[PDB]
């Protein structure tokens, strides 16, 4: 008869993201004439740590195309980039790690990261540490390109979408065991209030479908409907299968 | 405490280009880089002109 | 017309100052905080007399709305005496008290005798 924890997540106010010390969103430059037709040079000024994010971020300074001022940007750092390196963004940029190129100019089999979904969205795919996308094939007829996402899914995107050559830096982070609850506490302290987690069978019936009973047990199949209403949809949602491979 | 009415000018200034902002070594590096890059730009331009004349 | 800025800015248009046909208030209001309203009465406690004798300072109970500049002006108008500095505080009873120190050119004792304290 009580709202369950998963339901209470949506309202927020204690489950909102912790973003006080973050350095701002990481994204490409806004797509403009120079990047659409030629190339624009930038210089990496700093590689910084973004709290709550495994991948490091790189500060890049560009010369504004038509204003007398500096154009400052914050890119997701690709492995191998360094302070003082020159970064080239555009259709005519060379195929080197760190450069941002339109997918039409990236040959098949290349390794890219922070791939745009819509032309000009400034990067949504393959952004986490150690992740990358692979260019599969190009379709000149309809101006679309096929890529392989980190999850293994194959997606078709317009060939005008941009991507950064190389893989995201910071790879191999998750292979290290934490060994203790304190490390997880520190990890999630900067992400959101999602830890520790209480098992549903440890609760009373009033606050979870798994609650209750003189023994700890679910008492009914943990696989639930895709259309099950909130508060009832707990456990393995719309599972096509369960158990080991 | 750096306010002009409170601190003498000599105390808050360095008599050199970019004085008080860039160190001496950084200023020297900037000057050398500017000169050499301009020289290489001239060299590239003259090389391109010579190649165009040859062809 | 040639526009060099993509952003549109509202053009500057002429504005006119108010020229009312009638005044909303028929006549200017009276000056409530005049010199007589500012200075209620001198304080004649033992501490006030000690201040008068020692520090050449007069103690007055003053309107709570009066500021130090108004107190100085009111003292000058009422008694024709310069003031070196005015210190003010609000007593626990809710009234304002002012310590008015006269310049060396003026004697506090003579001023107090003239006032009648």
């Amino acid at each position: 008869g009580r709202v369950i924890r998963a339901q209470r997540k949506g309202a927020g106010s204690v489950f909102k993201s912790h973003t006080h010390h973050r350095k701002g969103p990481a994204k490409f430059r806004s797509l403009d004439y120079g990047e659409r037709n030629g190339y624009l040079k930038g210089v990496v000024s700093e590689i910084i740590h973004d709290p709550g994010r495994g991948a490091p971020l790189a500060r890049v300074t560009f010369r504004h195309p038509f204003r007398y001022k500096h154009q400052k940007e914050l890119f997701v750092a690709a492995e191998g980039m360094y302070t003082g390196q020159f970064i080239y963004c555009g259709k005519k940029a060379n195929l080197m790690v760190g450069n941002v190129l339109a997918l039409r100019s990236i040959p098949e089999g290349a390794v890219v990261c922070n791939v745009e979904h819509k032309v000009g969205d400034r990067g949504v795919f393959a952004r986490c540490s150690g992740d990358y996308a692979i260019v599969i094939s190009h379709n000149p007829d309809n101006g679309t390109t096929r890529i392989k996402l980190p999850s293994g899914a194959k997606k078709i995107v317009p060939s005008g979408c941009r991507a950064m050559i190389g893989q995201v830096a910071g790879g191999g982070r998750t292979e290290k065991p934490m060994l203790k609850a304190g490390n997880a506490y520190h990890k999630y302290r900067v992400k959101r209030n999602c830890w520790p987690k209480v098992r549903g069978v440890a609760m009373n019936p009033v606050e979870h479908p798994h609650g209750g009973g003189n023994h700890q047990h679910i008492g009914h199949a943990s696989t639930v409907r895709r259309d099950a209403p909130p508060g009832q949809k707990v456990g393995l949602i719309a599972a096509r299968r369960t158990g080991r491979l | 405490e750096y306010k002009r009415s409170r601190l003498s000018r000599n105390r808050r200034t360095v008599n050199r280009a970019y004085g008080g902002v860039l160190s001496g070594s950084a200023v020297r590096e900037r000057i050398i880089r500017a000169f050499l890059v301009e020289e290489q730009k001239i060299v590239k331009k003259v090389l391109k002109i010579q190649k165009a004349k040859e062809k | 017309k040639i526009r060099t800025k993509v952003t549109f800015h509202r053009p500057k248009t002429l504005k006119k100052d108010r020229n009312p046909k009638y005044p909303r208030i028929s006549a200017p209001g009276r000056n409530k905080l005049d010199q007589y309203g500012i200075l209620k009465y001198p304080l004649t406690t033992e501490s006030a007399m000690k201040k008068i004798e020692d520090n050449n300072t007069l103690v007055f109970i003053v309107d709570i709305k009066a500021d130090k500049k108004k107190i100085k002006d009111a003292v000058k108008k009422m008694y024709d005496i310069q003031t070196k500095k005015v210190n003010t505080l609000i007593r626990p009873d809710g009234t304002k008290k002012a310590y008015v120190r006269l310049t060396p050119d003026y004697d506090a004792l003579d001023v107090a005798n003239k006032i009648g304290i």
């Binding site: 004439y33 204003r67 | - | 526009r3 993509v6």
Partner: protein, 233 residues
């Protein structure tokens, strides 16, 4: 003299900063401008029924100029002229024993009065503005003029029609009679207007309008057609 020299600027991607240019076509316009332009675009794109489409075919420039030159000499009297006439009549009322005055010949304006004159077969020429909003006020007028066999024309500018009759705008104007010295040229203009509008009413009753796409899509369609023709050639 030898101290003056050229300082050319290399303008390009990554080159010298460009000078001030015309950005008018990229301006983020206010809401009113955007809506008033998109309304015109939408009217162009959609198919216009013949009854509304007939208002896009206005009088020719030369014919319109001639008609308005003729109309300028039949304007209604202004306020000052009316006051002068009234005071003169009052002054000469008793002294002159009310002398007879010739009936004035002026253009007629006002939708009520014009419709009444058309229905009574008194109008000899009907001038209809092409930009009446809402257009339901005059969309039926050509049909009424045709049914009554009254020559009618559609001209550009309700503001101009209003200026004829000393008003901000006029939905339509009518002429019931013309002076003797102007009858032959009025007959010429009437014949021209009848041939242009009244005789083409039946054919225009079935002609739809609109359906015009944008210039970029038009160019794309033209390129596709050219490719197809070249392949078939």
């Amino acid at each position: 003299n030898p101290l003056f020299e050229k300082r050319p600027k290399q303008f390009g991607i990554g080159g010298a900063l460009p000078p001030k240019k015309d950005l008018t076509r990229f301006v983020r316009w206010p809401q009113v401008v955007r809506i008033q332009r998109k309304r015109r675009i939408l009217k162009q794109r959609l198919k216009v029924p013949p009854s509304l489409n007939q208002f896009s075919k206005t009088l020719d420039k030369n014919l319109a100029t001639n008609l308005f030159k003729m109309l300028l000499k039949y304007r209604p009297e202004d306020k000052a002229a009316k006051k002068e006439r009234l005071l003169k009549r009052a002054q000469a009322e008793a002294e002159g024993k009310t002398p007879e005055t010739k009936k004035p010949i002026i253009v007629k304006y006002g939708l009520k009065h014009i419709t009444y004159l058309i229905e009574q077969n008194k109008a000899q020429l009907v001038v209809i503005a092409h930009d009446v909003d809402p257009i339901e006020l005059v969309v039926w007028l050509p049909a009424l003029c045709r049914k009554m066999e009254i020559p009618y024309c559609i001209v550009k500018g309700k503001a101009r029609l209003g200026s004829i009759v000393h008003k901000k705008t006029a939905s339509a104007l009518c002429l019931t009679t013309v002076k003797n010295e102007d009858k032959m040229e009025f007959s010429r203009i009437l014949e021209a207007i009848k041939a242009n509008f009244n005789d083409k009413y039946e054919e225009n009753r079935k002609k739809w309008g609109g359906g015009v796409m944008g210039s970029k899509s038009q160019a794309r369609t033209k390129a596709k057609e050219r490719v197809l023709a070249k392949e078939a050639a």
